[PDB]
Design a binder for this molecule. Structure first.
Ligand SMILES: *[C@@H]1O[C@H](CO)[C@@H](O)[C@H](O)[C@H]1NC(C)=O
Ligand SMILES: *[C@@H]1O[C@H](CO)[C@@H](O)[C@H](O)[C@H]1NC(C)=O
Ligand SMILES: *[C@@H]1O[C@H](CO)[C@@H](O)[C@H](O)[C@H]1NC(C)=O
Lengths: 197, 35, 105, 128, 104, 128, 105
């Protein structure tokens, strides 16, 4: 109802108004982001799945998930802060010889609330698009970071994955995940395994 | 020796409205509206 | 040759009843099915295109669903003007095959 | 208000040439994004697809009718035609020409007009 | 809108990708539908008259009528411009994602 | 209103097994994005970290306590436990269980609730 | 083993004074420091997480800053309820080390 007193939420003519604070729910031989999302990823939004000699498991990237949380929280906070809908407290009454002022009051009350309903709905849908593109760009910038780290030591299988020409242990898998990776150390073994393949 | 770049998915059925797409199922969402 | 199986080939219902016409595919038809309605002494018209989406000039009583091999056409309430033979046409392949036809009565 | 008008012979001898034409009126046949299709129906039987043509040039014909029939697109006279060779007892049918659009378009975002996205049909001609 | 041109031994011709064009039509139709549906401009039916000693309510009525119309004009023009820009980037990304699909 | 409640023996002999458990009430322990952590404090000394466990399965321990202690996540009983072997004089300490979240989230854009992003602690149990 | 050196280990101030607690790192801790506060006969609670960001339920008097090896925790005005031992915990590595603890008095 528009007439509210006290510390109150702003009034819109909306049935549903939900902000995306996550990725698209696309469930699913564990392959990367081209095939879909990982159900077994739980400790974050973005991350890695390694398979090597010692073991296999999912490892979330906490830094990119934290920066994504940092923008999504500011998006919801700016949605709350930028709305300046003024509260109606009483509702005005008019007699039989004040129909022109009654219609003007109804025009103002049915114009401002329509404008702010449009503004709130438009801001929610536009930043829903921006969130759903921001998450795709954040996965792609992670893939590009691992590609730029790995270079010619890795064979892409398509499907958001890399096969190392050389042999890596948990400490190497953990090194691509961390930002430190030694490209010239495994360069000769990558050359030997690339010449054989 | 494989590593992969993937993302989060779960059993959530939260549907949102995008401009060009309707009823997009998302992993996490917030409600802004009290009804 | 994707061969199309449509059931039930003879159907009878009264006014206000609800029926379901099911067309089955040999291979995988990925949302490429057209539903047709041939009223006697009249050219066929399309009701559902892309297996779920209503055409223009077609009432909201008709509905379509399904993916892959199995598809359904549900009429919500039969009217007396809904006396026609119903066909299913696939266009996923470059050779198109119609259904054999289900005549409601 | 695009309409398809069919002219047929109506009476052909067996082992002859069945020449049909479908004249497009109210629109252009030289517009991309449509299947210019030929559908026949045997009397007391169901619909059977024969062939299509597209202004791009693609033509597709039935596996039972690959070598016998041919379909052509007459761009200048705004019509498309079907010619059936070696006419037999099974070739007598109610022949329909159709404009099956490529895409489901209710607003004309591709087609350009709201009536472009529509599947129109010829009323039907009978060959014997 | 999107598709292929092949050159090989048998022949050469253009072939359209109907699935990506259909999905592009599916967003562009919903963009036009959202631009039509979201505008809630209220209709003026009569226009109010005022006498000589009601100039303050006359100026307030023209202020409301020329403020709401300017706000909805700005909203319509901004929504059309932003969704035009999103369409022109969406088509470029739809060609590039098709190129990336053929590359992969 | 997620609360972490601890049950301990309170009296263990030297060279024995210290079975400590921390029961999570008001929430699920089978939620990802948290470190289910065990912190001990010697009497009249400082805080010392012992181990953590996640719902994924990641597990880490102190370098002074790699082989002695173990930490487990009881998903069905909604608790996590710490078992200390070869208890000595230095093992007598005030043990705290904690839920350290992975991310700073005051809104619940990941956690889903505003109270998911909170670091909650057990009140403490004493072992001698 | 990333070792935490926290200074000054004994601190004394009155009500209204401003102090600064500094915790130093052996290796490089990139915004992965948690600031703790246990009041006697009470479980510890987190004040500052990610070395600069205030937790919920924590007043705005506490502040954190620093990156890499050096970090600072500044209390703007000491109240009588700010009588506690203050700890720094790193979680950059998978082996977490607490500080020795600074007891204000
Ligand atoms: C992780 O990164 C740090 C600094 O960025 C580096 O010192 C270390 O060697 C890296 N690798 C591992 C396995 O910790
Ligand atoms: C997903 O599963 C959890 C498991 O308990 C349940 O609590 C939650 O309600 C489920 N979500 C949906 C949308 O079904
Ligand atoms: C979206 O969902 C609502 C309710 O679940 C439904 O009324 C609406 O038709 C749906 N729209 C589409 C495009 O599926």
């Amino acid at each position: 109802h528009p007439v509210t007193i006290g510390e109150c939420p702003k009034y819109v003519r909306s049935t549903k108004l939900r902000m995306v604070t996550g990725l698209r729910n696309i469930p699913s031989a564990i392959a990367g982001f081209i095939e879909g999302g990982w159900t077994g990823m739980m400790d974050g939004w973005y991350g890695y799945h390694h398979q090597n000699e010692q073991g296999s498991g999912y490892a979330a990237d906490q830094k990119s998930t934290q920066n994504a949380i940092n923008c999504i929280t500011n998006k919801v906070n700016s949605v709350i802060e930028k709305m300046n809908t003024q509260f109606t407290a009483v509702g005005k009454e008019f007699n039989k010889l004040e129909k022109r002022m009654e219609n003007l009051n109804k025009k103002v009350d049915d114009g401002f609330l329509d404008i702010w309903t449009y503004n709130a709905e438009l801001l929610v849908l536009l930043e829903n698009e921006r969130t759903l593109d921001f998450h795709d760009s954040n996965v792609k910038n992670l893939y590009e970071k691992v590609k730029n780290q790995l270079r010619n030591n890795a064979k892409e299988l398509g499907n958001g994955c890399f096969e190392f020409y050389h042999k890596c242990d948990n400490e190497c898998m953990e090194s691509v995940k961390n930002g430190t990776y030694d490209y010239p150390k495994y360069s000769e073994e990558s050359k030997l395994n690339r010449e054989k393949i | 020796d494989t590593i992969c770049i993937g993302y989060h998915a779960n059993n959530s059925t939260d549907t949102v409205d995008t401009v060009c797409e309707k009823n997009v199922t998302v992993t996490h969402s917030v409600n802004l509206l009290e009804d | 040759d994707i061969q199309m199986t449509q059931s039930p080939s003879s159907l009878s219902a009264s006014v206000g009843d609800r029926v379901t016409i099911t067309c089955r595919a040999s291979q995988g038809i990925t949302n490429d099915l057209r539903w047709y309605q041939q009223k006697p002494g009249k050219a066929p018209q399309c009701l559902i295109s892309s297996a779920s989406r209503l055409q223009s000039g077609v009432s909201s009583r008709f509905s379509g669903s399904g993916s892959g091999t199995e598809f359904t056409l549900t009429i919500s309430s039969l009217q007396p003007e809904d006396f026609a033979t119903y066909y299913c046409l696939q266009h996923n392949s470059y050779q198109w095959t119609f259904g054999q036809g289900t005549k409601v009565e | 208000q695009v309409q398809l008008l069919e002219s047929g012979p109506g009476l052909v001898k067996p082992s002859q040439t069945l020449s049909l034409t479908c004249t497009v009126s109210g629109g252009s046949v030289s517009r991309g994004g449509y299947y210019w299709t030929w559908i026949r129906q045997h009397p007391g039987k169901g619909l059977e697809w024969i062939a299509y043509v597209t202004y791009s040039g693609d033509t597709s014909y039935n596996p039972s009718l690959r070598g016998r029939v041919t379909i052509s697109l007459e761009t200048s006279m705004n019509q498309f035609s079907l010619k059936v060779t070696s006419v037999t007892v099974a070739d007598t049918a109610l022949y329909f020409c159709a404009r099956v659009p490529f895409y489901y378009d209710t607003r004309g975002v591709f087609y350009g007009n709201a009536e472009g996205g529509f599947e129109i049909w010829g009323q039907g001609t009978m060959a014997t």
